[PDB]
Design a protein around this nucleic acid. Structure first.
Length: 54
DNA sequence: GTAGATCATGGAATATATCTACGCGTAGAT
């Protein structure tokens, strides 16, 4: 939330923020930076067993 | 003859980006 409230052009701390975030999301860094928004959303919804569909 | 014992005698608010001072590791010269 802080990273999304601060200026978006500001870089994010890799090991401090992104790697733990994708870790808790059960998502590889490759999947996060490579897949499009549709695939990422579908995989996130399946990972947390949500019923959403983007 | 007298004192003691005995007997009679009795109705109904938190995290984070930013600014600043300091030691200092390394760069530069020879």
């Amino acid at each position: 939330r802080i990273a999304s409230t601060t200026n978006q052009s500001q870089p994010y701390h890799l090991v401090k923020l992104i790697i733990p975030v994708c870790e808790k999301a059960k998502i590889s860094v490759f999947q996060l930076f490579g897949s499009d928004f549709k695939e990422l959303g579908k995989i996130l919804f399946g990972n947390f067993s949500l019923e959403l569909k983007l």
